[PDB]
Structure formats: structure tokens, C-alpha cells
């Protein structure tokens with residue numbers, strides 16, 4: 172390899188952007204700026220955008236990637252159907268797919284994921300419930316698939332003396348849903364939704380007087396740190412959730428400041444909420460791929476050829492690289508990155524946060540081990 | 541229209557076949573044999589087979605169907621991923637998709653389905669549980685998506701004093717799973733799996749002494765009537781499940797006898813288990829489409845043009861035909877066929893059956909209304 176090339180697929184239709192493209196560039200720059208002994212091949216990241224909601228588009232994008240000679244494909248972060256199409260094609264060609272968003276809910280060739288598994292999210296929520304003395308609860312789901320995502324927790328409630336009252340937004344305003352929860356007179360409300368939908372639910376809850384001291388909320392979104400509930404919350408609250416960020420990572424300041432400058436070219440600096448987790452996962456993903464490829468390269472000569480959608484040819488090194496990906500131990504923006512036999516993150520933590528008027532406080536940690 | 545043409549997609553990799561191809565021919569023959577006043581256009585059914593487990597294949601099959609000038613696409617019955625690809629392409633081209641297998645779990649343009657909805661299956665199971673005085677239970681799932689398919693029942697257990705212990709086969713032999721259920725010492729076992737997997741679970745249960753009078757089974761498969769548990773069951777049992785068949789339908793004898801001759805060209809007449817429900821749903825589907833098209837044709841002139849995967853052209857009549865499909869009232873092999881505003885079967889029944897040494901007995905009825 173004259174260069175170590177990977178592809179990344181972005182799907183970002185937000186007004187301000189999540190900054191994944193810049194995050195990828197920052198990882199590449201950081202890695203290429205460190206001259207190693209022996210010298211290593213330059214890292215390249217080819218970036219492709221998804222602008223429609225179309226698996227035709229996603230398939231065509233993969234067909235454009237295969238001829239470029241890549242050692243991995245990253246993402247997309249926020250498009251589960253597209254990520255499944257990517258995983259399938261990557262599996263057929265034996266190119267590693269590096270996943271950076273939620274487990275697809277509900278494949279032979281292996282992939283890895285930097286995003287916490289569904290089981291881990293369930294266990295983290297259950298840890299907070301243990302802290303509440305294992306109460307009855309209500310669950311608000313953005314999508315019906317929540318019962319699958321949270322199957323571990325659901326199975327626990329199904330055999331426990333406590334109850335779980337489940338309600339789906341699917342489809343406009345959560346107010347009638349929240350009024351039913353209020354009538355049940357149960358304190359603990361679990362919200363399984365992305366950040367914007369979670370904000371909407373909390374806003375409507377606040378308006379109904381449901382952010383009083385009686386009620387306790389647990390959110391599943393890993394973008395909790397960017398959820399700003401100004402005007403809803405005081406300096407202390409009962410609104411809990413998670414973060415993966417290690418703000419002490421040596422690159423974290425440059426990362427935040429750089430993404431702030433990314434944000435403030437389409438929007439105002441004052442509205443930058445902090446770095447998006449998906450951007451940090453993409454940064455970390457580049458390092459994981461580079462680490463694995465350089466370790467594989469000590470024991471075997473790695474080459475790439477054009478692959479194609481119109482050929483049954485596979486990448487001969489993909490099986491090997493999947494095993495070396497599973498050997499990676501990397502300290503990233505998102506904490507310790509290591510993988511288990513299923514390609515899932517292991518030996519890591521989630522910080523448990525409580526929302527406040529200006530941001531949050533950390534009040535505990537969930538350990539995957 | 542000189543002819544009324546629809547397409548049907550088959551995916552059948554069974555040794556003996558389910559007889560869907562013959563079922564389609566029988567419907568076409570029956571309809572074309574009735575000379576109406578005024579005379580109506582001849583019915584044609586173009587048949588396509590899926591032989592791989594590939595959405596590339598399914599998409600290519602749809603691309604072959606679009607130029608043929610069809611008024612609907614039927615199926616496939618037993619291939620959920622392929623049926624979803626078909627629904628998507630049909631929706632893009634505004635051609636009705638007539639579904640004949642389980643609700644996909646977890647679309648703008650409307651479709652209809654002749655197969656009972658997930659909610660209806662949950663409600664039918666809950667009706668049997670009411671008959672058992674609403675006990676605690678165990679659920680054996682072939683796939684994790686069972687919690688979604690049975691979400692209505694799961695939500696009921698989550699708020700009830702009774703427990704539900706859920707276990708997934710996902711992945712070889714159910715024996716260890718059944719031993720855990722045995723240790724829980726709960727009587728009622730719900731099996732959500734297709735017919736062959738359900739048979740396997742009951743066989744292993746029998747071997748463990750778990751088909752004694754203490755245990756009660758409820759199966760979700762609509763192919764219960766073809767599940768032959770010879771050697772497991774006596775003349776009476778506690779093994780319950782469902783059938784859609786109306787064995788008094790005037791065509792039922794010809795249907796059974798004809799599919800018996802279909803079966804016994806690849807296998808032995810003695811191993812023919814009776815007609816497969818998917819074959820009967822395909823037969824009924826042809827009648828539903830013909831009924832709707834001939835009613836639409838009273839009020840508007842229907843034409844077809846070649847459509848194509850490489851064109852954005854839609855079928856101008858698809859919206860109209862979807863509304864007329866929803867007006868159909870048809871008495872079929874699978875009972876009364878009518879649709880609600882969601883395109884789901886309504887105003888119908890499921891017969892509740894108890895397995896016996898030679899077959900079954902009907903012991904009750906579930907009404908959708």
C-alpha cells in the first residue's frame with residue numbers, strides 16, 4: 172500500500188451539521204503528522220454523502236466506493252437502513268464495515284461497531300433503575316422497535332413484580348401520551364428517542380408540570396450532552412442520561428474548538444451545543460482502522476485491487492483485517508475502544524449525567540464489565 | 541385493457557412445494573371460466589420465482605415485472621425482506637402490492653394484506669389466555685423480532701400481575717431452553733415460530749415429558765392445520781393454534797385435491813399434509829384484485845403502459861385501485877376478505893384448533909370484531 176485509504180459515508184441533513192466531515196479530516200491530519208519509525212503509509216479518507224432517503228442511492232454510493240481500493244468503510248452514523256445496506260455489500264466483498272451508530276434492530280462476514288450495543292444501553296438504564304430501588308416505570312418510544320432495542324430491560328420487567336407502561340409516539344405531539352402517563356401516577360419515565368424528539372418530550376412534560384421533583388427521567392440518547400434544556404431545568408434536576416466523551420483526552424480541546432468553527436459557518440457560535448458524538452465516533456473509527464491495518468501489515472503484505480459491484484471478487488485481506496480490528500486497544504475521544512468476539516465495544520464506560528440549567532453534572536459511571 | 545394482468549412472486553425452496561403456482565392457475569381458471577354480462581377481460585397471472593436470498597435478485601425481478609403492464613403484484617409469501625423490497629418499488633411506481641404473509645416487523649403509498657395483522661395474532665393468543673384465566677406464561681421465539689410482532693400481548697403482560705418469561709432460539713436445539721422453562725414451573729407456553737420450528741420445539745418438549753396435562757401450548761403459526769404431531773399427541777391434547785381455512789368454501793375440495801396432485805409429483809401422496817395457507821391466500825388474492833379492478837373499470841377507463849426501473853413514471857390508476865381494493869368484500873378459501881383503512885383484514889375469524897393424533901378439532905373462534 173502506497174496509501175492507507177478508507178471510505179466514510181455521511182448522511183447529515185441538519186441545519187448546522189454534526190461536523191463528521193471535519194472530524195474525519197482532523198483524525199487523518201493527526202495521524203499523518205506523527206512520523207513513525209519505520210515510516211508508515213499516508214492515511215486517506217474518501218468521503219461520500221447520502222442526500223436522499225434511498226437505498227438505491229446508498230447502493231450506488233457503495234458501487235462508487237469499491238473501485239477505489241479501500242481497507243474499510245465507515246458509517247453512516249444516523250441512517251440505520253443505509254447502514255444495513257452498507258454492511259451487506261461490505262460483507263459480500265469482505266471489506267470491513269466500521270459502524271458508528273445504533274445497533275440495527277433487528278450477516279456472516281464480521282463487522283465492528285464503536286456505538287454501544289443495545290444490551291449495553293439496556294444494562295445502563297437498568298443500573299440507574301437499581302439506584303431508584305427498581306421501581307415501576309413508563310417507557311416512551313419514538314419507534315415501536317424500542318421494545319427490541321430495549322429487550323433486555325423489557326424481559327426484566329416481564330418477570331418482575333414491577334410494571335412498565337409502554338407508549339409510542341408513532342405520531343405528532345406527545346402531550347396526550349404524557350397525560351396518560353400522568354394518570355398512571357408512576358414517577359420514572361424512560362425516553363427512548365433521538366435528541367430532538369427527547370427534547371420535545373421533555374418540553375411538553377415541563378409544560379404539564381411533569382418535571383417536578385416527583386418525576387424522574389432516564390434518556391437513552393448518547394447525545395445527551397448536547398441536549399440543552401434551558402428554561403426547563405434548574406441547577407439540579409431528575410433528568411438523567413449518558414455520555415461517552417472523555418473530555419480529558421489530549422485532543423478533546425482542539426476537537427471541540429474545531430467543531431465550533433465548523434458549526435459557526437452555517438450558524439451562530441452561541442448556538443453550538445458542543446461536539447456531536449457521531450463526529451467523535453468517526454474520529455475514533457479512523458484511528459481504529461489505522462491501528463489494525465498497521466498491525467496486520469507487520470505479518471502480511473496488504474494490497475488492494477479495484478472491486479466492483481459487477482464482479483464477485485472479494486478483498487483477500489478482509490478476513491484477516493477483521494481479526495486485527497478485534498485486537499485493537501485504543502484510547503479515544505469516546506473512551507477506551509476494544510471489541511469483543513461479536514465486534515461490540517467492551518471494557519468501556521458510560522458516564523451518567525444529570526441535566527442542569529447550563530449543562531450537566533456527572534453523578535455516576537456504568538461499567539460494561 | 542385487453543387483459544387484466546397481475547404478477548405474482550414466489551419464493552419456495554421446500555422439497556414438496558406449497559403449491560402456490562398451481563393455486564394461482566386455479567384462481568385464474570375459475571375466474572376466466574365464468575362468462576359474465578357484460579363480458580370481462582381475461583385474467584392473466586405472470587409468475588416470477590425467487591431462488592436466492594438476495595435483494596439484488598428481488599429488485600431485478602421487479603424490474604422485469606414493471607414493463608409487463610400489471611395492475612398488482614402479489615407476494616412473496618414467506619420472504620419478509622423480499623416482500624419489503626417489493627412494497628417499496630410498488631409504492632414508488634404506484635402499483636398495488638397485495639401481501640400474503642406476515643406483517644413486516646418493524647411507506648406512503650398504501651398496500652393491502654390478506655394475512656392477519658400482528659395485532660390480530662396477539663389478540664387471538666390473548667383470547668386463548670383469557671380462557672386459561674389469564675395465567676403467567678413463557679414465550680419461545682424463533683426470532684428476537686417476536687417481541688415486536690407480539691407487542692400487544694407483551695404490553696399487556698408488562699402491566700399485569702402475571703409474568704412472561706421470554707426465550708429465543710437464536711440458535712440450534714431448543715432443549716436447553718425448554719429445560720429452563722420446565723424449571724420455572726409455569727404451565728402455558730406460547731410458541732412464535734414457523735411450522736417446522738414449532739414442530740421441532742414440540743418434539744423436544746414431548747421428549748422431556750413436557751406434553752403432559754399440566755402444560756398448555758399456544759402456537760402463532762397460521763399453518764397449524766398442516767403441522768402433524770403424529771406420535772406426540774393423543775386424541776385430545778393441550779396444543780392449540782389457529783386456522784383461516786373455510787373448508788366449506790365451494791372450491792375447497794378441488795383446491796385440496798388439486799394441491800394433493802401438485803404435492804405428489806415431487807413426493808408421496810401419503811406425506812401431503814393438506815393445503816398450505818399461503819397457497820390459499822394467493823388464490824384469494826387473485827380474486828380480490830380482479831374484483832377491485834372490475835369495479836374500478838365501471839367508473840374509469842383503466843390502461844397500462846410499460847413502467848421501468850429507469851423511469852420515474854408512475855401508474856396513474858394506482859391510487860384509485862388502492863381505494864377500490866379497500867372496498868372489496870370477498871368470500872374466500874381463507875374466509876371473509878375485507879380491509880380496513882390501514883389495508884389490513886377486518887371482519888373475519890380465526891378458528892381455534894386443538895391438535896389430535898390424526899389432525900385436529902375446532903374448539904372455538906376468535907372474531908376480529
Ligand SMILES: *[C@@H]1O[C@H](CO)[C@@H](O)[C@H](O)[C@H]1NC(C)=O
Pocket residue numbers: 172174175209210211212464465468469473
Ligand atoms: C507496511 O510496513 C512497511 C515497512 O515497515 C511500510 O513501508 C508500509 O508503509 C506499511 N504499510 C502501511 C499500510 O502502513
Ligand SMILES: *[C@@H]1O[C@H](CO)[C@@H](O)[C@H](O)[C@H]1NC(C)=O
Pocket residue numbers: 417418419420421502506507520
Ligand atoms: C481520558 O483521557 C485521559 C488522558 O489521556 C486518560 O488519562 C484517561 O484514562 C481517559 N479516561 C477514560 C475513562 O478512558
Ligand SMILES: *[C@@H]1O[C@H](CO)[C@@H](O)[C@H](O)[C@H]1NC(C)=O
Pocket residue numbers: 427431440441443444445
Ligand atoms: C464556541 O466558540 C465561542 C466563540 O469563541 C465560545 O464563546 C463558545 O463558548 C464555544 N462553545 C463551546 C460549546 O465551546
Ligand SMILES: *[C@@H]1O[C@H](CO)[C@@H](O)[C@H](O)[C@H]1NC(C)=O
Pocket residue numbers: 507518
Ligand atoms: C480495560 O481498559 C482499561 C483502560 O480504560 C485498561 O487499563 C485495562 O487494561 C483494560 N482491562 C482489561 C481487562 O482489558
Ligand SMILES: *[C@@H]1O[C@H](CO)[C@@H](O)[C@H](O)[C@H]1NC(C)=O
Pocket residue numbers: 541543544578579580581833834837838842
Ligand atoms: C371494462 O368494462 C368493459 C365493458 O363492460 C369490458 O369490455 C372490459 O373488458 C372491462 N375491462 C376489464 C379490465 O374487465
Ligand SMILES: *[C@@H]1O[C@H](CO)[C@@H](O)[C@H](O)[C@H]1NC(C)=O
Pocket residue numbers: 786787788789790871875876889
Ligand atoms: C364458508 O363457506 C360457506 C359456503 O360458501 C359459507 O356458507 C360460509 O359463510 C363460509 N364461512 C365463513 C366463516 O366465512
Ligand SMILES: *[C@@H]1O[C@H](CO)[C@@H](O)[C@H](O)[C@H]1NC(C)=O
Pocket residue numbers: 796800809810812813814
Ligand atoms: C391425497 O390423495 C391421496 C390419494 O388419493 C389420499 O389418500 C389422501 O387422503 C389425500 N390427502 C389429503 C390430505 O387429502
Ligand SMILES: *[C@@H]1O[C@H](CO)[C@@H](O)[C@H](O)[C@H]1NC(C)=O
Pocket residue numbers: 876887
Ligand atoms: C362481516 O362479514 C360477514 C360474512 O362473514 C357479512 O355477512 C357481514 O355483512 C359483515 N359485517 C359487517 C359489519 O360488515
